[PDB]
Ligand binder design. Sequence first.
Ligand SMILES: *[C@@H]1O[C@H](CO)[C@@H](O[C@@H]2O[C@H](CO)[C@@H](O[C@@H]3O[C@H](CO[C@H]4O[C@H](CO)[C@@H](O)[C@H](O[C@H]5O[C@H](CO)[C@@H](O)[C@H](O)[C@@H]5O[C@H]5O[C@H](CO)[C@@H](O)[C@H](O)[C@@H]5O)[C@@H]4O)[C@@H](O)[C@H](O[C@H]4O[C@H](CO)[C@@H](O)[C@H](O)[C@@H]4O[C@H]4O[C@H](CO)[C@@H](O)[C@H](O)[C@@H]4O)[C@@H]3O)[C@H](O)[C@H]2NC(C)=O)[C@H](O)[C@H]1NC(C)=O
Ligand SMILES: O=C(c1ccc(-c2ccc(Cl)cc2)cc1)N1C[C@@H]2CN(C(=O)c3ccc4[nH]nnc4c3)C[C@H]2C1
Ligand SMILES: [Ca+2]
Ligand code: NA
Ligand code: NA
Ligand SMILES: [Zn+2]
Length: 806
Amino acid sequence: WTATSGSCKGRCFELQEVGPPDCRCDNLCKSYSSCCHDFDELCLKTARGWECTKDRCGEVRNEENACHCSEDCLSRGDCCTNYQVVCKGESHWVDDDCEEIKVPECPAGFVRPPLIIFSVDGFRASYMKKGSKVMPNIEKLRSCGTHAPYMRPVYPTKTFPNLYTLATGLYPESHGIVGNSMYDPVFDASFHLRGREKFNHRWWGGQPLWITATKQGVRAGTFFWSVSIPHERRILTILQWLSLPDNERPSVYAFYSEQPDFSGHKYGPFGPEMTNPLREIDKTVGQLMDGLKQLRLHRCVNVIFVGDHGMEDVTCDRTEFLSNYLTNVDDITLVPGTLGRIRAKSINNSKYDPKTIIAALTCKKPDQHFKPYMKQHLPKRLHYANNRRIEDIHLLVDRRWHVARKPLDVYKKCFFQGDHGFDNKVNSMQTVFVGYGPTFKYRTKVPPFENIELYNVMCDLLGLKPAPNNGTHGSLNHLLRTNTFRPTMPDEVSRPNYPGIMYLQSEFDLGCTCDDKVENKLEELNKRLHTKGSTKERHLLYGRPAVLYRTSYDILYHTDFESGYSEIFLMPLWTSYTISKQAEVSSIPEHLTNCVRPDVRVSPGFSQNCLAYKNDKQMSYGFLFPPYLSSSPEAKYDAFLVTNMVPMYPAFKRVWAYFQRVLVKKYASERNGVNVISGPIFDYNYDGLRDTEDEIKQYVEGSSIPVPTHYYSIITSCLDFTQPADKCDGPLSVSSFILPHRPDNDESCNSSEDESKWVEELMKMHTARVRDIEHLTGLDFYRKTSRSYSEILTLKTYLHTYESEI
Ligand SMILES: *[C@@H]1O[C@H](CO)[C@@H](O[C@@H]2O[C@H](CO)[C@@H](O[C@@H]3O[C@H](CO[C@H]4O[C@H](CO)[C@@H](O)[C@H](O[C@H]5O[C@H](CO)[C@@H](O)[C@H](O)[C@@H]5O[C@H]5O[C@H](CO)[C@@H](O)[C@H](O)[C@@H]5O)[C@@H]4O)[C@@H](O)[C@H](O[C@H]4O[C@H](CO)[C@@H](O)[C@H](O)[C@@H]4O[C@H]4O[C@H](CO)[C@@H](O)[C@H](O)[C@@H]4O)[C@@H]3O)[C@H](O)[C@H]2NC(C)=O)[C@H](O)[C@H]1NC(C)=O
Ligand SMILES: O=C(c1ccc(-c2ccc(Cl)cc2)cc1)N1C[C@@H]2CN(C(=O)c3ccc4[nH]nnc4c3)C[C@H]2C1
Ligand SMILES: [Ca+2]
Ligand code: NA
Ligand code: NA
Ligand SMILES: [Zn+2]
């Protein structure tokens, strides 16, 4: 109940929210059905339109007008945005040459450059180039300010998850808005685009920029606009707020456009009808910048032009129906469309089984346009599992397609030609970032980056301390002229032991054998050198990883590789080795096929054993440093140490052996040498964070050998590939992956074929940032390079996507 008897008189677009039943006059009241009786008449004036014409100049103030062209309008802060152009001979902002803004030029009483976030829904990154002819205002912001060729959204590439990720720096699994539609089984409550539950605070986790600002004494304009408030009015409202007295005036503002998403859904991303919405958005930008220029704020304000996600061609005919796969289609609830989420229709149904549902959905049709996953098996780069609102069963839908439960859902709910939601590495889902103002750089292009990184920068722009988030603070310092945040490397928590030879071969009873009993001071002094680190500069190029948690581990040196061996987990946390362009691949000699060798630097009690693998009928083993890449037949024996062994399902060994025998050499040839760091990951509770020893759900049968959920590799080389990986003088280049360690290759529908047809495609799907591996391992990489730390942070957030040209 709202008693709408009060008045909006002198309260139009007031900043403080007033609770029921006193009537509201803020930009949200429409959505709440709570506006005072006179809100429209007083606050939403439209009379005479939005532009001054010659004859309006000098007019006597008529209060009924939408905006004014009277002589007092500048000081009332309520001129039409084109007033100075029409009435005072000024130019439109877009027509002025751009000139570097070296320092803020703010009027008196401005304590900091204000920040204006201009967010556009469904603005696909390629619009910046493809519509540049019809968007001169946006093209000027882009060419004169700082821009990326594209910004990567979060998964799913839906509106509410991405806008709230923009506001918080958080993955949707952490902020809680994991779709536009959700069911929370703890609340027993549903979040819908339609209705009042979505307003309830309990859906919205983390701390959005406007709350961060407010808690730290920086006032914010409201970010939310009721759909019926016309864009011209939203702009006039911002400009009016910017004329408030100093103590009242917000420092951060947001504008939001429903376009081009609205038309893109109807017409497709490049429908001929899309030119007009792009023009209109440009005009709105022109209005804002002209209005800032009148207020003398156009060289004071930092403006961010940012999208939530792109738009792909999708039509009704490209829909896959679960009724063509499942017999029990009525025992399931599906969240449908460009992603699928499946749960039981009824909690009282004990004949519901996710395993038979996944199996009925796996590789069933030749050209199947979706792939099912238990959420824990989704690519770790999606970070989409650790929330109770995310259903256990997930369908990743191919770009251009939908999934639906039954055909009746698609015709009794073609209409649409565009949609979004797909995998966030898809080219069509990329969106835009432009920053313009005194704090951003001048005419600077920056590499693509992820939207989770912006919250930190928006905090930096406002002098705020960000709440804890998933951005990596300092990774976007290269966007900024000043206000850079100067991070320090994390302190190493555990120091390594450097074991020498401490055990005799007969102290070991590991059930392993090796045909290695074959035999010289020339070569013996030499192998002693290798075991103390004499080749360590070749194989460990960026310093040893730092261990950021409390544990007990040994550094082990070898001719061809170095490792940090965990006495707790019984295997390396990391193994580092360099493969030059000239290196040669060899096979494992016949007599060494089953060779495992005790490591005389590491006690039997802190070693694995071969008996456990013999007795575990499901589990085999692989090696982190690959015997195929040994530098010499004698160095090969090091690769068969028990301290280089890791548990691997036979099915996973197919992937791993192809990566090690074929792909590392291929990368070394292509990149002029590579440095590889590989190791295990344990994330049994799928939170994206290193498991402690007591979280491990699976061991090699009858042993204390923990089974990894994933294996990672970080592959680094010189960005200037004319220099070899091991003699690189400048910036680095990296690609990484986090491969799921699974007992089957059900994920790969072509896995019955030769690895050359399916392994690399698997690995591409599981591409990752170094930072993702850092979270999963508690390791910090690239501690000793000649590069600035900020540049290294950027490298660690890089994701190699394998998409073609945007
Ligand atoms: C991305 O960045 C984010 C932000 O930094 C990272 O998320 C953080 O990670 C931490 C580790 O997972 C986590 O810390 C925990 O905090 C618990 C208290 O949390 C509340 O308070 C904070 C602060 O205001 C608040 O933000 C939290 O909000 C969550 O939950 C609400 C309501 O459900 C949601 O609205 C909100 O969206 C958010 O949900 C997300 O996080 C939670 C986990 O907190 C998930 O469950 C959700 O699925 C969702 O992802 C909370 O309101 C605190 O209780 C924890 O401490 C336990 O464990 C430690 C072990 O060290 C121990 O010291 C304690 O004793 C305690 O153990 C006891 O509880 C156990 C579990 O119940 C029980 O088993 C034991 O027996 C004990 O009784 C813990 O410190 C932090 O909350 C989140 N923050 C956010 C915002 O999500 C994220 O990791 C980053 N991702 C990556 C990949 O890097
Ligand atoms: O009020 C806001 C808001 C604006 C900006 C920021 C914002 C957040 C962070 C920053 Cl940094 C800036 C602005 C925060 C909220 N709304 C209201 C709008 C309602 N809505 C949809 O109904 C909708 C739209 C497109 C879709 N496609 N498919 N389904 C769709 C459903 C989109 C919502 C956005
Ligand atoms: Ca974990
Ligand atoms: Na076995
Ligand atoms: Na398969
Ligand atoms: Zn949309």
